[PDB]
């Protein structure tokens, strides 16, 4: 039985900590919604 | 139930203890997830129940309470921020420039953040706050990192 409870407001964070790369990659979505490289 | 817009963790009492399996954004009345957090089963906010209204296992998207709402769109351009709720942790922003998934039927952003599995359905937004899509559905490259795609669905 699932439930749900409030953890904060959407808003854009001035300042926030910024990290994470950007790569381009070739993927298929199957109709599972599976994700996959393609090479 | 509690209806206010915003960012709520989805849990379950059905393992051990209570467990964070994802994450959900409230819009206009409308609870929205990633299909694989819920399995489109129905949720409880207090005494108040919420159905399923429209899911596509495809999409990896589930809507209750009413039609999806979310319509920002990430611009191809600029950073945006995972709001992300991890489990028993705080809801934190992170920003990042996304990266981008190239498919044969077009392509999608995508962000290269790496968080447990119960954080999918944290939602991603742009510099005024609009959701432009949900965390949680990607794939594991070279190195076993983590890269998910930035999921939108479509308002009717
Ligand atoms: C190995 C897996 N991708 C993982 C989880 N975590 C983690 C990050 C934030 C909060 C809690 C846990 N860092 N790496
Ligand atoms: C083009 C549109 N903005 C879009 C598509 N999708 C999507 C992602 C994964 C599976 C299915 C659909 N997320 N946003």
């Known amino acids: 039985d699932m439930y749900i409870e409030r953890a904060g407001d959407i808003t854009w964070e001035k300042d926030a900590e910024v990290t994470g790369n950007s790569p381009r990659l070739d993927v298929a979505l199957d109709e599972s919604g599976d994700f996959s490289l393609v090479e | 139930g509690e209806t206010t817009d915003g960012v709520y963790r989805v849990?379950?009492?059905?393992?051990?203890?209570?467990?964070?399996?994802?994450?959900?954004?409230?819009?206009?009345?409308?609870?929205?997830?990633?299909?694989?957090?819920?399995?489109?089963?129905?949720?409880?906010?207090?005494?108040?129940?919420?159905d399923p209204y429209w899911g596509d296992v495809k999409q990896d998207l589930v809507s209750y309470c009413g039609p999806?709402?979310?319509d920002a769109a990430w611009d191809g351009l600029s950073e945006v921020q995972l709001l992300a709720v991890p489990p028993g942790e705080r809801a934190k922003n992170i920003q990042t420039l996304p990266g981008i998934?190239?498919?044969?039927?077009?392509?999608?952003?995508?962000?290269?953040?790496?968080?447990?599995?119960?954080?999918?359905?944290?939602?991603?937004?742009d510099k005024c706050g609009r959701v432009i899509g949900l965390y949680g559905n990607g794939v594991v490259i070279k190195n076993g990192s983590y890269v998910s795609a930035i999921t939108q669905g479509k308002r009717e």
Do not use: C, N
């Not at chain 2, 994450?23 to 108040?48: D, N, P, Y």
């Open chain 2, 101 to 125: 998934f190239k498919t044969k039927d077009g392509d999608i952003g995508a962000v290269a953040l790496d968080y447990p599995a119960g954080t999918s359905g944290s939602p991603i937004l």
């Open chain 2, 68 to 70: 999806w709402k979310l």
């Open chain 2, 11 to 50: 849990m379950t009492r059905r393992l051990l203890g209570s467990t964070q399996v994802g994450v959900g954004v409230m819009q206009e009345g409308v609870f929205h997830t990633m299909w694989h957090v819920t399995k489109g089963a129905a949720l409880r906010s207090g005494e108040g129940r919420l």
